[PDB]
């Protein structure tokens, strides 16, 4: 019949308190078999009314069924797909106004709404823009309401979506997503870039880590480069991830990738180049000694390829690739260069406590130095134990342990020191026999 008549009958049915009968009346109209031929433009207002009522009554299933059934009828024309996307947007704007007005079941309703719209707009060339919009809105929603569980499921949904796109690539059907086109990719990559950001901000490190692989695969296929802003943010997220992760070589790498990209910004102060360069160098000195093959087991081995590295580097290699690169080594604080001399170049155990004692007063004031104190200490002490292994045959525990006591803030209690000595022995940086009877240590 007529849309005006439909709206009227709805408005009348709400006055009698038959709200559900009104929603159900509109559903019938817009999912009617005659809608396939109707002008999308002139039925869309009824779909809008259907959405208005459906949101108030929180009838999520009927809304979903309404949209899907309507789209199947209408998606034949270009104007049809346009109406679909427009009705998707209307739905989202309606529920998004309800969160503004409002509540637990309202958040879940909102999630289910975002989810439904995304699953409705999935893998359609004409709806790529609206979908990419809803993805961004959905990720902003999860971060804004710390909905970590739903976020994890969202991420999985986006993965399944892309898997279907890839399967459909070799099908040449109309209105199918073309993963060959850079604009399509620019959006998909932007979504995955944002997926990583929210992951990091919600401290879901396992999910952050999975999304790095998601992003990488899109960067591979992508011909067109991303915005240097959004890419710089990405690398800045990787520095966070790999620090939490305990992969220090990857951490330095993410920093270098970020430094190399930030040195091409017009608004980049010299004070920043000072502190960033310093951070990068310290984190490379602060890296665990790989001067001996690992125990060894490493579940993060695949990640080197994900950071575009052909293979796992050494700390010596990384540290040299930092010293040689003048763009970085140039703006590095002097204290760190001296440190590098003291620990890596000319290491003398008989003088290291002193060198460090004179250098740490200046180093402690540095902002970045605070967060690398532990691993650095570990490195220095490892070196001290190795060199001590070279210096003694049977040394008193008193002598050895005090000789391995760095100055603050690298200081350690005597028992934590023996603890380090044994760890070095387990990793075979030294073989020892400790006689607790005599309070002596023998390197045999």
Author numbering: 6 to 107, 151 to 492
Reproduce the article's own wording on this structure.
The structure of the full-length PCI domain of eIF3a (S. cer. residues 1–496) was solved by single-wavelength anomalous dispersion (SAD) with selenomethionine (Se-Met)-labeled protein to a resolution of 3.3 Å. As observed in a truncated structure of eIF3a and in previously characterized PCI modules (Ellisdon and Stewart, 2012; Khoshnevis et al., 2014), the WHD is structurally similar to other PCI proteins, whereas the N-terminal domain has a series of distinct, flatly arranged helical repeats. The positioning of these helices is reminiscent of the concertina-like arrangement of tetratricopeptide repeats (TPR), although, as in other PCI proteins, TPR-like sequence elements are not detectable. Unlike other PCI HDs, which typically have a significant right-handed superhelical twist, eIF3a has two distinct segments to its repeat. Whereas helices 10–14 have a right-handed pitch, helices 1–9 are arranged along a flat plane that is distinct from other PCI proteins with extended helical repeats. PCI modules are characterized by an N-terminal helical domain (HD) and a C-terminal winged helix domain (WHD), which mediates PCI dimerization (Ellisdon et al., 2012).
Eukaryotic translation initiation requires the recruitment of the large, multiprotein eIF3 complex to the 40S ribosomal subunit.
